[model samples]
Target: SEISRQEFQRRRQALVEQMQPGSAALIFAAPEVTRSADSEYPYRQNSDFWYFTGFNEPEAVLVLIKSDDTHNHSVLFNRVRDLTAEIWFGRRLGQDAAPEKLGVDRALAFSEINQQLYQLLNGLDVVYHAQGEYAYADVIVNSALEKLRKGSRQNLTAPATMIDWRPVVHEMRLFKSPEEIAVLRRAGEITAMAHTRAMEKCRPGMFEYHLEGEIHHEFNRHGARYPSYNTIVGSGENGCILHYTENECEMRDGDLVLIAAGCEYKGYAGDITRTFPVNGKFTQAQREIYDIVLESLETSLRLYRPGTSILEVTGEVVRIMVSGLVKLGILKGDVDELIAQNAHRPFFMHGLSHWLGLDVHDVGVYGQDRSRILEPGMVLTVEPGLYIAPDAEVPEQYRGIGIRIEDDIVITETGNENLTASVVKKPEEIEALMVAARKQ
Candidate 1:
């Protein structure tokens, strides 16, 4: 856990206070699901559930029952230790140690959850849950609610209110605590080295998978076992697809390779994307378009600060990119009109950035009054890109081109600091790094 024990206790106590008196809140940990018959992707805990309870193991739920002060009742249900199963799988904390370790009032085995859930649900005036998060949870909670309505117990037959607690908790997570920032810094450091290594290895005739394998190796070696999401290692025409991840096909003679990837460190994510020439040197036209997108990212980074919004950066980048398109003769329409009709979106469809934390697109509410404002202690990505598919009828010089530059940043009290700043983004620097790799 990146956060201290004291911090976790404080947040849990705060959440308990936020719940209505006599309310029961149920939150489940994310389950490990199989990707195929004998394979399983690593399990990551649900952000919200993990926030309330620092317990990361699966088959667990945190139940908060509010009393007069609303912080009197807290219970954790976790998997029990099984020696036979431990040999097959792994060790578990079991109920005996979870209470003392987690600072909760009570702890019990997971099997106790089904038999005792109805009792915990009884006598509550309100039920506070995020709702629609899990199908099985919905079925269990609904069944418990129905049982309570049967009126066999002395408790209330129906909840006075069913409030949604996600908005409240999400708002709290938007502003990174000092602990969260440290984890993000680590993510950036590891990912930056990976990006630099990949840039050095880009050469004609090398398969894209070779580069992806190198990046993946870097992440695991540095303690980030998994990417925050699927990585995009696209080259040539494949780069035109925004979300392409097929790392097949050898690097072509005159094509550019775009590598987009981020590592997950303590649930915090750092996204850094870079595109470079395949032959360790950029073609004149490739350099020109890449410069446009790279400069756009730089300009956008300057606009990140407290009181800023994604719209502010996007608006500025749109102006620069649209103007660049006209200057390059890639699009003949007026710049303002092109922006108005979202003409640039076909090439740059994604937004300027998104909140980054436990999840790559971390849980947080960004808008109020139909607008989202950036604030200090916020970590986000600053990415700007342009893509011209081979099939598109565009200028011969700019056809089949794709370029994107992205980096993770954290807004400070003054402005923002680029966490991935160690990764080279300059054209001269990228060329130098690649040349050095080839020589090695």
Candidate 2:
């Protein structure tokens, strides 16, 4: 089913309220990009443009006209349908169907955009558009505006001011409403289910890519075709390659497999990553390192509430990881010296978490001048990891091991709530889930 049309309509109306009177706001859909001469990359709509229209077809534009005649009127301009084009590519809902289907005031074909907009902007004082980047769209809008100004029979004035509106729309997307959170929560649930299935199905000697397939099966079974990002199925020494997506490695007998993935529902996404032993049970060394990383992540999550900085939470994780590294005889140095030079970063890499919503590494500035404090309705990921590469210099027991545990949460007034609470992270709980799966 299509997502709530009313939610998008409400977002557009809110934007209209903030816009100045007698101004025109334009948001363009991403043009089909080239992969080769005749082939095009699979189209993905820009999130901000999609937020207001829920229209997925590409090379479209949304025009919200805040004029004297009708201040809140909106129009969408998209491709006109051609049978030969649809037969070769896919389907497109032509301009006429957009009004009823998209719940917009009016819809027009791409051909009509220039002429109609010229007449609409004839008397407008200013044109408000998102005008910071993407040189191609800039050329299109400027050319259209120039044509409108030059051909006017009544000596109509062109807009003297072209105000940028990206900041205005970006601010609105930072915080989630109750409705937005509900969709995201479901995405979290489905993603958690996929993670659970992978954990249960894991076995020693299975290819890391096979586990990746299991995740795809579960995600598709639950009705979400799109994953938040490419699934990372790194095993043992390979886990050290952060953002490692070459998931075709063979799982060794004594190793950990880290599965990082999530599902996107409507536009919102929830990301989760969990690393566990390839065998049903963790070895003595594996358990020790897993405990350290898990405890450090838990500590960060406990302290991750409103009024706390992301830097503060990550510091705690780093401190715990560094201390545990010393106890394991991995890093032989003073804790302060190791962390100061970021020696710990070689083993424990990347940030603990980021804002999660419409995108996996979702929108929202963590800081403008300073850091953005944790606010209610802000969804984020708490992920902490430790990777020790297999090498001659490293301690034998510490070598070839990796561990990371992640979960999705939303900040609440009180503290925070785990959206993926149904998925077990506790070591004992994972053991039980695996044992149950084996028996089945």
The candidate that achieves the highest TM-score relative to the unseen native structure: 1
Worst 10 residues of 2 by lDDT: 363-372
Model 1, position 150, has a per-residue lDDT of 82
Estimate the lDDT of model 1: 0.84
At residue 393, give the lDDT of candidate 2: 55
TM value for model 2? 0.91
Residue 244 Cα positional deviation in candidate 2, in Å, after optimal superposition: 1.3
Q: What's the CA RMSD of model 1 in angstroms?
A: 1.8
Span of ten consecutive residues with least summed lDDT in model 1: 151-160
Please write out the lDDT profile of model 2 over residues 112-225, one tens digit for every residue: 776776666666777877775566668767876887678667676677788888778877887888888888888889999999999998888789989889998888887878
Best-matching candidate per lDDT: 1
| Model 2: residue 301 alpha-carbon error in angstroms | 2.0
Identify the runs in model 2 with alpha carbons over 4 angstroms from their true place. 1-3, 33-42, 68-70, 87-90, 132-136, 148-154, 336-341, 368-370
Per-residue CA lDDT of model 1 for 1-440, tens digit only, reads 37777877877777777877778778888888899997886778988887777767888888888877724777888898999999898888888888888888888888767677878877778888767988767777777777778856565475757888888788778888888888899999999999998988767888988889889999999999999889988999889888898788888978999999999887778788999888878888998898889889888778788887888778889889988888888878888889898778777888778888878887787675315877789888888999987876777888889888999999998889899989999999988888888888
